[PDB]
Amino acid sequence: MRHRKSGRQLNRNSSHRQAMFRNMAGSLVRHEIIKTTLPKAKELRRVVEPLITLAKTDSVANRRLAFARTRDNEIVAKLFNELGPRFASRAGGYTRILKCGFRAGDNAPMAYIELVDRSE
Amino acid sequence: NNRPVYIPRPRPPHPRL
Amino acid sequence: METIAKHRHARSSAQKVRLVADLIRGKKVSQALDILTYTNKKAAVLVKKVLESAIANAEHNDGADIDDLKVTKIFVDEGPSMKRIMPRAKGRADRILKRTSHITVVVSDR
Amino acid sequence: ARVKRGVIARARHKKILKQAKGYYGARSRVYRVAFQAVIKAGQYAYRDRRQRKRQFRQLWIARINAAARQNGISYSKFINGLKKASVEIDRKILADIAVFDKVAFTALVEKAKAALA
Amino acid sequence: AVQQNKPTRSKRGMRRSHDALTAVTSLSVDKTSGEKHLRHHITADGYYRGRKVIAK
RNA sequence: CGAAGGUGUGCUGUGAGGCAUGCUGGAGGUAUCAGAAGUGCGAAUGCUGACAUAAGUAACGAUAAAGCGGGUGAAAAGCCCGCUCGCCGGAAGACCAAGGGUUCCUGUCCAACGUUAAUCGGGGCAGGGUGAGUCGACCCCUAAGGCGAGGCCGAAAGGCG
RNA sequence: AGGACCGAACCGACUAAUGUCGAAAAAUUAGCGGAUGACUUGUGGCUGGGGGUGAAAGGCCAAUCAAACCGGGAGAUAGCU
RNA sequence: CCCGGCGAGGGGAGUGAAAAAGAACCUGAAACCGUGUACGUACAAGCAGUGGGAGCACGCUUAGGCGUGUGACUGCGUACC
RNA sequence: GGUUAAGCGACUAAGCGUACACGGUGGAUGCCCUGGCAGUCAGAGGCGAUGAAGGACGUGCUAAUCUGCGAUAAGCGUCGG
């Protein structure tokens, strides 16, 4: 009855939920920022930072495992090259969530989720 | 504003016999 | 001065917009605008447009200084409704009421 | 010679609704229900025109009894003295005297007691 | 499963007494840009804690 | 210098009623005494229209699935573009007959229609679009069967051939 | 060779569940029967209501059949509500 | 002319005797749905009325009360066909 | 005058009720009608193979519908008003 359990269902089956986070995680890395519902952004964190932590240290095995997740060569290239060093000194908390009102389509709470970077 | 044309046959009643 | 402002045949039902009307009833326009701006209903934007029009009429057709204006009379009354036939199970037919309403806004300085 | 009854019908309905004004819910808005209330109201008014006389009669008797007990005599005994003394003051007055003029009511019982004795 | 007789308009109104909405009454003003916004939300033009966050 | 009707109030009669007047209304009304009735509604699971109730409740029509960026826009979960994910793949693909009859394409519009929004559409408005000696129909021949000159039969109609 | 066997298309509709103001005025889902034959299907014909048709259930004959549907006799009659 | 989306709808101006005659257009009733004001209502049981009746809020002439609205509390009272 | 105790006690309305005022919905009523109903007094009582009744498709400066007309196509000739 959900005591101490974790992991939002988000009205999707396990396969659909896994694929969605895999796609959304890739889009976040590619663009550094994305607009999505607040519950999705919160649950996306438990999938996003673990990728950056692995990218902090570079190895053949780590590159392969990082590819097995997100199944995209562009993202792996994006990782291990600048996301790695740019967060080497940071111990977690690579993500920031900003609430941005509600979606007009269905009044869903929306929020920008963006990596702590882009300080130009 | 047409009055209902097709009225279905009533559900058979419980046999009180 | 009255500076009424009506919006007739509004898409929403009379009931659904009354909840929004009660929120701003009797309150000053300044707080009325933001409340409608940040209320999560279409009746909020529907009423907000009427309230904006009422303010515009007061400023243009009548005395300026819209700052000291209060919504004295806010009310909604249901208007003409459209009849639609919708099929149901077993071949039966029901009537769907696309209800409409008229929103009236009155803002006065005193 | 077709005869329309639209005008007459509204006149009759208004006349009933006017008498039914003040009633609760549909009893003051709906003719089909307001008519029952008006008729039923008429029965009660006719009934109460008679109940009113007896309710006031018993109210006066209670007032006279309370004054008599307070001043040291039963209501039954008090009425005997007045009958024996040949006093034709009714219950309404006796109750009126008791509330307003205490001294007068004291005079009433003293003769009532004297008549009994 | 179905009503025995229609309720009264008063009984109808009493049921709706709890359906009334409530205003937020918690508008916040940004320190720098000074616009009204919901607490813990970014402004319409994209300022939060003064510093811009959307860069757009 | 305000009829009928409508909406109030004040009087009056034992009752059905009547009288007066305020507001609305805007041009018909009708005393008295007689005459003639489609002459009075609360019910008939009455008829027609309008509006309530349940109730802002059930539901929003296959559990194949969506996510993000950009664009247009007053407004984008639903439209267009791109990158991913998912589903069908003896079909949920591609061509015809039957049947529809412009649903085709372009521009423009979002009231109504779409079970939500809508800039979108098989929606509204305008314009454009169907090119055959060889494809099909038509055409030549015939099956079942139809009609049927004369004819046979039948009150008539008509039946059979 | 076979009114042969297993089994898709196709035809059928035995069991259960769901659905009964349903997606559907008998359907869906998971199994099930026949599947070279008394098979199934397209197109067009024929049989018309005291009749048709029927491997026969009073079944079927345009969502209606112990006598279809439409119009007329007809405002049938109703010792009943 | 102004708000609005080069809208819907509305507010001014203008026409007219009249625009609550604006094409959703003569008159505009009832059910039904609202806004404002006065009174009552969160310890009180039932055809919701009637008889009695305090208080309160509005009008009168008088300074005493009468009218209108409401109705605490209390007796009686189980719709119509 | 202060403290304590005891007794009584209005002021509340989320909402609802009754009354009045102002509105919406709705389209009753009143008024009106070149539309009908039933008659009286007359005419006529048939149309058609020199192609009828009734239709289709066309016909204009113009997209549609109605009326008129028929590739001489909202018309042509002649005689009258």
CSV table of N, CA, C and O (backbone and C1' of nucleotides) in Angstrom, one decimal, chain G residues 34-63:
chain,number,residue,atom,x,y,z
G,34,G,P,-14.5,-30.7,-36.0
G,34,G,O5',-15.1,-30.2,-37.4
G,34,G,C5',-16.3,-30.7,-37.9
G,34,G,C4',-16.8,-30.0,-39.1
G,34,G,C3',-15.8,-29.8,-40.3
G,34,G,O3',-15.7,-30.9,-41.1
G,34,G,C1',-16.8,-27.7,-39.8
G,35,A,P,-14.3,-31.4,-41.7
G,35,A,O5',-13.8,-30.2,-42.5
G,35,A,C5',-14.5,-29.7,-43.7
G,35,A,C4',-14.0,-28.4,-44.1
G,35,A,C3',-12.5,-28.3,-44.6
G,35,A,O3',-12.4,-28.7,-46.0
G,35,A,C1',-12.9,-26.6,-43.1
G,36,U,P,-11.4,-30.0,-46.4
G,36,U,O5',-12.1,-30.6,-47.7
G,36,U,C5',-13.5,-30.9,-47.7
G,36,U,C4',-13.9,-31.6,-48.9
G,36,U,C3',-13.0,-32.7,-49.3
G,36,U,O3',-13.8,-33.8,-49.8
G,36,U,C1',-13.1,-31.2,-51.0
G,37,G,P,-14.4,-34.9,-48.9
G,37,G,O5',-15.8,-34.3,-48.4
G,37,G,C5',-16.8,-34.0,-49.4
G,37,G,C4',-17.8,-33.0,-48.9
G,37,G,C3',-19.1,-32.9,-49.7
G,37,G,O3',-20.0,-33.8,-49.3
G,37,G,C1',-18.2,-30.7,-49.2
G,38,A,P,-21.2,-34.2,-50.3
G,38,A,O5',-22.4,-33.2,-49.8
G,38,A,C5',-23.6,-33.2,-50.5
G,38,A,C4',-24.6,-32.2,-49.9
G,38,A,C3',-23.9,-31.1,-49.1
G,38,A,O3',-24.6,-29.9,-49.2
G,38,A,C1',-25.5,-32.3,-47.8
G,39,C,P,-23.9,-28.7,-50.1
G,39,C,O5',-23.1,-27.8,-49.1
G,39,C,C5',-22.5,-28.4,-47.9
G,39,C,C4',-21.3,-27.6,-47.4
G,39,C,C3',-21.4,-26.1,-47.6
G,39,C,O3',-22.2,-25.5,-46.5
G,39,C,C1',-19.3,-26.8,-48.4
G,40,U,P,-23.2,-24.3,-46.8
G,40,U,O5',-22.2,-23.1,-47.2
G,40,U,C5',-21.3,-22.5,-46.1
G,40,U,C4',-20.3,-21.6,-46.7
G,40,U,C3',-20.8,-20.4,-47.5
G,40,U,O3',-21.2,-19.4,-46.7
G,40,U,C1',-19.0,-21.5,-48.7
G,41,U,P,-22.4,-18.4,-47.2
G,41,U,O5',-21.7,-17.5,-48.3
G,41,U,C5',-20.6,-16.7,-48.0
G,41,U,C4',-20.0,-16.1,-49.3
G,41,U,C3',-20.9,-15.4,-50.2
G,41,U,O3',-21.2,-14.1,-49.9
G,41,U,C1',-19.5,-16.9,-51.4
G,42,G,P,-22.5,-13.4,-50.5
G,42,G,O5',-22.0,-12.8,-51.9
G,42,G,C5',-20.9,-11.9,-51.9
G,42,G,C4',-20.6,-11.5,-53.3
G,42,G,C3',-21.7,-11.0,-54.2
G,42,G,O3',-22.1,-9.7,-53.9
G,42,G,C1',-20.5,-12.6,-55.4
G,43,U,P,-23.6,-9.2,-54.1
G,43,U,O5',-23.9,-9.4,-55.6
G,43,U,C5',-23.1,-8.6,-56.6
G,43,U,C4',-23.5,-9.0,-58.0
G,43,U,C3',-25.0,-9.0,-58.3
G,43,U,O3',-25.6,-7.7,-58.5
G,43,U,C1',-24.0,-11.0,-59.2
G,44,G,P,-27.1,-7.4,-58.0
G,44,G,O5',-28.0,-8.3,-59.0
G,44,G,C5',-27.8,-8.1,-60.4
G,44,G,C4',-28.7,-9.1,-61.2
G,44,G,C3',-30.1,-9.3,-60.7
G,44,G,O3',-31.0,-8.3,-61.1
G,44,G,C1',-29.0,-11.4,-61.2
G,45,G,P,-32.5,-8.4,-60.6
G,45,G,O5',-33.0,-9.7,-61.5
G,45,G,C5',-34.3,-10.3,-61.2
G,45,G,C4',-34.4,-11.6,-61.8
G,45,G,C3',-35.5,-12.5,-61.3
G,45,G,O3',-36.8,-12.2,-61.9
G,45,G,C1',-33.5,-13.8,-61.3
G,46,C,P,-38.0,-11.7,-61.0
G,46,C,O5',-38.7,-13.1,-60.5
G,46,C,C5',-39.0,-14.1,-61.5
G,46,C,C4',-39.3,-15.4,-60.9
G,46,C,C3',-40.2,-15.4,-59.6
G,46,C,O3',-41.6,-15.3,-60.0
G,46,C,C1',-38.3,-16.8,-59.2
G,47,U,P,-42.6,-14.4,-59.0
G,47,U,O5',-42.8,-15.5,-57.8
G,47,U,C5',-43.3,-16.8,-58.1
G,47,U,C4',-43.4,-17.6,-56.8
G,47,U,C3',-44.0,-17.0,-55.6
G,47,U,O3',-45.4,-17.0,-55.6
G,47,U,C1',-41.9,-18.1,-55.0
G,48,G,P,-46.3,-15.7,-55.6
G,48,G,O5',-46.0,-15.1,-54.1
G,48,G,C5',-46.5,-15.8,-53.0
G,48,G,C4',-47.3,-14.8,-52.1
G,48,G,C3',-48.4,-14.0,-52.8
G,48,G,O3',-49.4,-13.7,-51.9
G,48,G,C1',-46.7,-12.6,-51.9
G,49,G,P,-50.8,-14.5,-52.0
G,49,G,O5',-51.4,-14.4,-50.6
G,49,G,C5',-51.4,-13.2,-49.8
G,49,G,C4',-51.6,-13.4,-48.4
G,49,G,C3',-52.2,-12.3,-47.6
G,49,G,O3',-53.1,-12.7,-46.6
G,49,G,C1',-50.1,-12.9,-46.6
G,50,G,P,-54.5,-13.4,-47.0
G,50,G,O5',-54.1,-14.9,-47.2
G,50,G,C5',-55.0,-15.9,-47.7
G,50,G,C4',-54.8,-17.3,-47.1
G,50,G,C3',-55.9,-18.2,-47.1
G,50,G,O3',-55.5,-19.6,-47.2
G,50,G,C1',-55.4,-17.7,-44.9
G,51,G,P,-55.1,-20.2,-48.6
G,51,G,O5',-53.8,-19.4,-49.1
G,51,G,C5',-52.5,-19.8,-48.9
G,51,G,C4',-51.5,-19.0,-49.6
G,51,G,C3',-50.0,-19.5,-49.6
G,51,G,O3',-49.8,-20.5,-50.5
G,51,G,C1',-50.0,-17.2,-48.9
G,52,G,P,-48.7,-21.6,-50.3
G,52,G,O5',-47.3,-20.9,-50.4
G,52,G,C5',-46.9,-20.3,-51.7
G,52,G,C4',-45.7,-19.4,-51.5
G,52,G,C3',-44.5,-20.2,-51.0
G,52,G,O3',-43.8,-20.8,-52.1
G,52,G,C1',-44.8,-18.3,-49.7
G,53,U,P,-43.4,-22.3,-52.1
G,53,U,O5',-42.2,-22.4,-51.0
G,53,U,C5',-40.9,-21.8,-51.2
G,53,U,C4',-40.1,-21.6,-50.0
G,53,U,C3',-39.9,-22.8,-49.2
G,53,U,O3',-38.8,-23.6,-49.7
G,53,U,C1',-40.6,-21.1,-47.7
G,54,G,P,-38.8,-25.2,-49.4
G,54,G,O5',-38.5,-25.3,-47.9
G,54,G,C5',-37.3,-24.9,-47.3
G,54,G,C4',-37.4,-24.8,-45.8
G,54,G,C3',-37.7,-26.2,-45.1
G,54,G,O3',-36.6,-27.0,-44.9
G,54,G,C1',-39.2,-24.5,-44.3
G,55,A,P,-36.1,-28.0,-46.0
G,55,A,O5',-35.3,-29.1,-45.1
G,55,A,C5',-36.1,-30.0,-44.3
G,55,A,C4',-35.2,-30.6,-43.3
G,55,A,C3',-34.4,-29.7,-42.3
G,55,A,O3',-35.2,-29.3,-41.2
G,55,A,C1',-32.9,-31.3,-43.2
G,56,A,P,-34.9,-27.9,-40.4
G,56,A,O5',-36.1,-27.7,-39.4
G,56,A,C5',-36.4,-28.7,-38.4
G,56,A,C4',-37.8,-28.6,-37.9
G,56,A,C3',-38.5,-29.9,-37.5
G,56,A,O3',-39.4,-29.7,-36.5
G,56,A,C1',-39.6,-28.9,-39.4
G,57,A,P,-39.0,-29.7,-35.0
G,57,A,O5',-38.6,-28.2,-34.7
G,57,A,C5',-38.3,-27.8,-33.4
G,57,A,C4',-38.4,-26.3,-33.2
G,57,A,C3',-39.8,-25.7,-33.5
G,57,A,O3',-40.7,-25.8,-32.4
G,57,A,C1',-38.2,-24.5,-34.7
G,58,G,P,-42.2,-26.2,-32.6
G,58,G,O5',-42.7,-25.0,-33.5
G,58,G,C5',-42.7,-23.6,-33.1
G,58,G,C4',-43.1,-22.6,-34.1
G,58,G,C3',-43.9,-21.5,-33.6
G,58,G,O3',-43.2,-20.4,-33.1
G,58,G,C1',-45.0,-22.4,-35.5
G,59,G,P,-41.7,-20.6,-32.4
G,59,G,O5',-40.7,-20.9,-33.6
G,59,G,C5',-40.6,-19.9,-34.6
G,59,G,C4',-39.3,-20.2,-35.5
G,59,G,C3',-39.0,-19.1,-36.5
G,59,G,O3',-38.3,-18.0,-36.0
G,59,G,C1',-39.0,-21.2,-37.5
G,60,C,P,-38.8,-16.5,-36.3
G,60,C,O5',-38.4,-16.3,-37.8
G,60,C,C5',-37.1,-16.3,-38.3
G,60,C,C4',-37.0,-16.3,-39.8
G,60,C,C3',-37.9,-15.2,-40.4
G,60,C,O3',-37.3,-13.9,-40.4
G,60,C,C1',-38.2,-17.3,-41.5
G,61,C,P,-38.3,-12.7,-40.3
G,61,C,O5',-38.9,-12.6,-41.8
G,61,C,C5',-38.0,-12.5,-42.9
G,61,C,C4',-38.8,-12.5,-44.2
G,61,C,C3',-40.0,-11.6,-44.3
G,61,C,O3',-39.6,-10.2,-44.6
G,61,C,C1',-40.6,-13.7,-45.1
G,62,A,P,-40.4,-9.0,-44.0
G,62,A,O5',-39.2,-7.9,-43.7
G,62,A,C5',-38.2,-8.3,-42.8
G,62,A,C4',-37.2,-7.2,-42.7
G,62,A,C3',-37.8,-5.8,-42.4
G,62,A,O3',-36.8,-5.0,-41.6
G,62,A,C1',-36.7,-5.7,-44.5
G,63,A,P,-37.2,-4.6,-40.1
G,63,A,O5',-35.9,-5.0,-39.3
G,63,A,C5',-35.5,-6.3,-39.1
G,63,A,C4',-35.2,-6.6,-37.7
G,63,A,C3',-36.3,-6.4,-36.7
G,63,A,O3',-36.3,-7.3,-35.7
G,63,A,C1',-34.5,-5.0,-36.2
